[PDB]
Enzyme design. Structure first.
Site, mmCIF file in Angstrom:
data_model
loop_
_atom_site.group_PDB
_atom_site.id
_atom_site.type_symbol
_atom_site.label_atom_id
_atom_site.label_comp_id
_atom_site.label_asym_id
_atom_site.label_seq_id
_atom_site.Cartn_x
_atom_site.Cartn_y
_atom_site.Cartn_z
ATOM 1 N N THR A 49 27.974 44.430 48.109
ATOM 2 C CA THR A 49 26.828 44.126 47.815
ATOM 3 C C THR A 49 25.517 44.558 48.900
ATOM 4 O O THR A 49 24.721 45.153 48.545
ATOM 5 C CB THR A 49 26.248 42.547 47.957
ATOM 6 O OG1 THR A 49 27.211 41.996 47.002
ATOM 7 C CG2 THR A 49 24.781 42.257 47.524
ATOM 8 N N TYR A 112 31.407 35.451 33.765
ATOM 9 C CA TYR A 112 31.183 34.995 32.662
ATOM 10 C C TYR A 112 32.018 34.071 31.707
ATOM 11 O O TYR A 112 33.196 33.715 32.101
ATOM 12 C CB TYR A 112 31.172 36.324 31.376
ATOM 13 C CG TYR A 112 30.090 37.401 31.887
ATOM 14 C CD1 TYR A 112 28.765 37.004 32.439
ATOM 15 C CD2 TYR A 112 30.448 38.762 31.941
ATOM 16 C CE1 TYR A 112 28.058 38.064 32.661
ATOM 17 C CE2 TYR A 112 29.669 39.691 32.423
ATOM 18 C CZ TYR A 112 28.323 39.362 32.755
ATOM 19 O OH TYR A 112 27.476 40.466 33.200
ATOM 20 N N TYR A 138 37.139 37.533 46.870
ATOM 21 C CA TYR A 138 35.675 37.359 47.073
ATOM 22 C C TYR A 138 35.109 36.030 46.620
ATOM 23 O O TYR A 138 34.833 36.284 45.355
ATOM 24 C CB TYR A 138 34.807 38.573 47.211
ATOM 25 C CG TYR A 138 33.144 38.682 47.429
ATOM 26 C CD1 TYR A 138 32.945 37.736 48.335
ATOM 27 C CD2 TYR A 138 32.368 39.439 47.008
ATOM 28 C CE1 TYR A 138 31.306 37.741 48.707
ATOM 29 C CE2 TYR A 138 31.116 39.432 47.279
ATOM 30 C CZ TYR A 138 30.744 38.598 48.119
ATOM 31 O OH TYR A 138 29.053 38.534 48.792
ATOM 32 N N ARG A 143 26.111 32.712 44.486
ATOM 33 C CA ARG A 143 25.541 33.820 43.922
ATOM 34 C C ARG A 143 26.169 33.795 42.465
ATOM 35 O O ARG A 143 25.282 33.978 41.488
ATOM 36 C CB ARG A 143 25.986 35.280 44.559
ATOM 37 C CG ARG A 143 25.064 36.406 44.266
ATOM 38 C CD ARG A 143 25.603 37.645 44.976
ATOM 39 N NE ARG A 143 25.688 37.770 46.411
ATOM 40 C CZ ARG A 143 26.555 38.518 46.905
ATOM 41 N NH1 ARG A 143 27.596 39.118 46.296
ATOM 42 N NH2 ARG A 143 26.277 38.737 48.312
ATOM 43 N N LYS A 167 37.637 36.636 51.539
ATOM 44 C CA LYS A 167 36.447 36.632 52.024
ATOM 45 C C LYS A 167 35.570 35.494 51.458
ATOM 46 O O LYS A 167 35.276 35.310 50.292
ATOM 47 C CB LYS A 167 35.323 37.697 51.384
ATOM 48 C CG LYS A 167 34.011 37.771 52.142
ATOM 49 C CD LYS A 167 33.094 38.860 51.816
ATOM 50 C CE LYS A 167 31.680 38.839 52.339
ATOM 51 N NZ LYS A 167 30.685 39.703 51.570
ATOM 52 N N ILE A 212 33.423 38.812 57.209
ATOM 53 C CA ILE A 212 32.961 40.032 56.671
ATOM 54 C C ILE A 212 31.396 40.149 56.712
ATOM 55 O O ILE A 212 30.513 39.361 56.005
ATOM 56 C CB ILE A 212 33.613 40.437 55.124
ATOM 57 C CG1 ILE A 212 34.988 40.564 55.348
ATOM 58 C CG2 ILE A 212 32.634 41.454 54.623
ATOM 59 C CD1 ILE A 212 35.737 40.923 53.969
#
Length: 300
Positions: A49, A112, A138, A143, A167, A212
């Protein structure tokens, strides 16, 4: 230089992708990479990102990753952001990364529908068998709205040998405690890295492995010392670093990352303050805030 090589400790920088006049700015990029290397940073995460992956095209990805591996020259692992919606797009990106000689990939949860915990496990399983790269889970529910449960991460740890770590960007203390506890009970050396700079101290105290980091783009020395002082038993000194990083840690998120981090790097003379739409350069307020914060921090 491989297999356990992706099990880095301390700081892995989620590095920005510098642009100038519409194109990659590999000259500035190289100056930033050296800033990272010279300061004890132990991994680079490229095209996450923070690196504006959604606006970097297929060829640019290739050139950025290849230049990264050239400069680094196997000194630290290079992990490439590769997760998208479909397992179709993801695997291809993972294949590209592998073909180029990257050490691992960072793979976001699918988003989704209403992904179940089995759904998530099956997603990382398919990718797992189709690559020899290190895979980093991740988990970023803030988000995506999708959370990998600590027990699901522990299944992954137990079963999928080439998934190196997670992460963990769920900041909740109750998740972090269990993500660390349960994954390491399933595999002693499964890595847990904070996905939030401000949770780094907490996650280390909980038994985790580092971070990270967005902040280490501008302040690699400091973020490195936070982790290093902890791993030396000096919590007081580690806490103190965390304490003094708070204004910078806060300032880098007053607009959507990487907007402020790029403004900060530009003030510091590393890059052009240039972002690809729909991101836009930081407001004057953000810039003045950053100027003052960076001055107090001794980085400007």
């Amino acid at each position: 230089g491989i297999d356990p090589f992706t099990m880095f400790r301390g700081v892995g920088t989620a590095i920005v992708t510098p642009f100038k006049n519409g194109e990659l700015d590999l000259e500035s990029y190289e100056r930033l990479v050296r800033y990272q290397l010279e300061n004890g940073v132990n991994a680079l995460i490229v095209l996450g990102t923070t690196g504006e992956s959604p606006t970097v095209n297929e060829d640019e990805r290739e050139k950025l990753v290849s230049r990264t591996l050239e400069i680094v020259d196997g000194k630290i692992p290079v992990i490439v952001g590769a997760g998208t919606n479909s397992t179709e797009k993801t695997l291809k990106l993972v294949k590209q990364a592998e073909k180029l000689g990257a050490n691992g990939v960072l793979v976001v949860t699918p988003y989704y529908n209403k992904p179940t915990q089995e759904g998530l496990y099956q997603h990382y399983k398919y990718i797992s068998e189709r690559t020899d790269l290190g895979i980093v889970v991740y988990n970023v529910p803030g988000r995506t709205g999708v959370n990998v449960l600590p027990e699901t991460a522990a299944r992954i740890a137990a079963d999928l040998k080439n998934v190196v770590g997670i992460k963990e960007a769920n900041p909740a203390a109750a998740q972090i405690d269990r993500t660390v506890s349960l994954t390491k009970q399933a595999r002693s050396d499964f890595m847990v890295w904070s996905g939030n700079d401000d949770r780094t101290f907490y996650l280390l105290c909980a038994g985790g492995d580092g971070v990270i980091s967005v902040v280490s783009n501008v302040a690699p020395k400091q973020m490195v010392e936070l982790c290093a002082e902890y791993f030396s038993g000096n919590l007081e000194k580690s806490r103190e670093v965390h304490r003094k990083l708070r204004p910078l840690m806060k300032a880098l998120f007053v607009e959507t990352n990487p907007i402020p981090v790029k403004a900060a790097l530009n003030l510091m003379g590393f890059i052009e303050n240039e972002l690809r739409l729909p991101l836009v350069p930081a407001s004057e307020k953000t810039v003045e805030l950053l100027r003052n914060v960076l001055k107090e921090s001794g980085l400007l």
